Structure 1
Amino acid sequence: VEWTDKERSIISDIFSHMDYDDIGPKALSRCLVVYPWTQRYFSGFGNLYNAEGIMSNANVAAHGIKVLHGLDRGMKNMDNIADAYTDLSTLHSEKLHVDPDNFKLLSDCITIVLAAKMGHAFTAETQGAFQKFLAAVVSALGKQYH
C-alpha cells in the first residue's frame, strides 16, 4: 500500500538491527507452544511434544531462521510486497498445504518476540509500523489460495 517515510524508516531500522539467529528460533518456538496446532506441519523435526523439547529443537530453530528471512524480500521492496510472495504463497498452498490463518498466529509471535528484545524501544508507532508490514506480508502469502 501507501507507506509513510517514517514507516519505511521504522521498518529499515528494525531490519537493520535484527538478530535473525535469536529472533527466528524464539518466534517459531513460541508459536509452536502457543498455537500447538501449528505443530501439524512439522512432523520430521523430532520432539515437538512439550515446551522444553520444542524450545531446544534444532530443526525448529533453523526453520525459524528461514521463516524470518522470508520477510527480507518484503521490506526490500515495500511497494511490491504482493508480487514478491506469489511464489512462496503458491508453495505454501499447493505444496505445503498450510492453513493461512497460521500466518497471523506466527506474525503475532514474531511481533511479541521483537517486543521483548526491543523493550522500551518497541513504541506503539513501531508496533503499528511493524504490524502494518507483517499484515501486508500475510495478505500476500494467503493470496494464491483457492
Structure 2
Amino acid sequence: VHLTAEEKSLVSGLWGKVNVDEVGGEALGRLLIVYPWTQRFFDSFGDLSTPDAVMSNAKVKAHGKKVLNSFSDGLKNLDNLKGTFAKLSELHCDKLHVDPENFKLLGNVLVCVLAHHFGKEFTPQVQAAYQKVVAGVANALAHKYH
C-alpha cells in the first residue's frame, strides 16, 4: 500500500474538500443501483426499488456517512490499514458474510463519485493514488478471510 509522499498529499488535498454529508450515501446508493445483488444486506433499510427511491432513502445517506468515516480513518492511518479495519473486517466477514469482491466494487464506485464531484480536478494522477487507497482499504477489510 505505497502512495508516494506526493500522492499522500495528492489525496488529502482532495479529501479536504470532500462533502462528508453527501459523498458517502451517494456512493453507497449507486452501488445498490449498479450492483443490485448488494441490497441483500440492506433488508432493514426500507424502499430501494427504483433509483430515485435509493437516492433519497435516508438510511443509505446516514449509513453512507458512517462508511465515509471509515475511509477518513483509513486516510489518517495509511501504514496500518489492518488494525484500523480489524474489527470492521470481522463484521463483514464473520457476521454479514459479504464477499470481499464487493469491497473492491464499493471502492470503485467511490472513485466514480469523486470523479463526478471533483470533475477535472480528479486528475489521472489523483485517481491512480485513490485507487491505491481503495485497494488497501477494500483488501484490509478482507483480512479475516486471509
- TM bucket (normalised to shorter chain) is over 0.9
CA distance in 2, matches of 1:104, 1:3: 18
> Aligned ranges for residues 1-146 of structure 1 at < 5 Å?
1-145=1-145
**Residue 46 of structure 1, CA deviation:** 0.5
Kept after mapping to 1: 8 A contact 2:46/2:57: yes
> 3-state SS of the aligned residue for 2:145?
coil
Provide the aligned C-alpha RMSD in A: 1.2
Kept after mapping to 2: 8 A contact 1:24/1:64: yes
Kept after mapping to 1: 8 A contact 2:82/2:140: yes
**Residue 3 of structure 1, CA deviation:** 2.9
CA distance in 2, matches of 1:50, 1:129: 33
CA distance in 2, matches of 1:22, 1:81: 24
* Identity within the alignment, %: 47
**Residue 82 of structure 1, CA deviation:** 2.4
**Residue 2 of structure 1, CA deviation:** 2.8
TM (norm. structure 1) is 0.95
Kept after mapping to 2: 8 A contact 1:85/1:141: yes
Kept after mapping to 2: 8 A contact 1:90/1:145: no
1:49-91 alpha-carbon deviations (Å, 9 max, x no partner) = 1212111100111111111111122111111112211111011
**Residue 135 of structure 1, CA deviation:** 0.4
CA distance in 2, matches of 1:14, 1:135: 18
Which deviates the most, 117-126 or 93-102?
Answer: 93-102
Tell me how many residue pairs correspond in the alignment: 146
**Residue 112 of structure 1, CA deviation:** 0.4
Query: Which amino acid counterpart does residue 39 of structure 1 have in structure 2?
Result: Q
TM (norm. structure 2) is 0.95
CA distance in 1, matches of 2:65, 2:145: 24
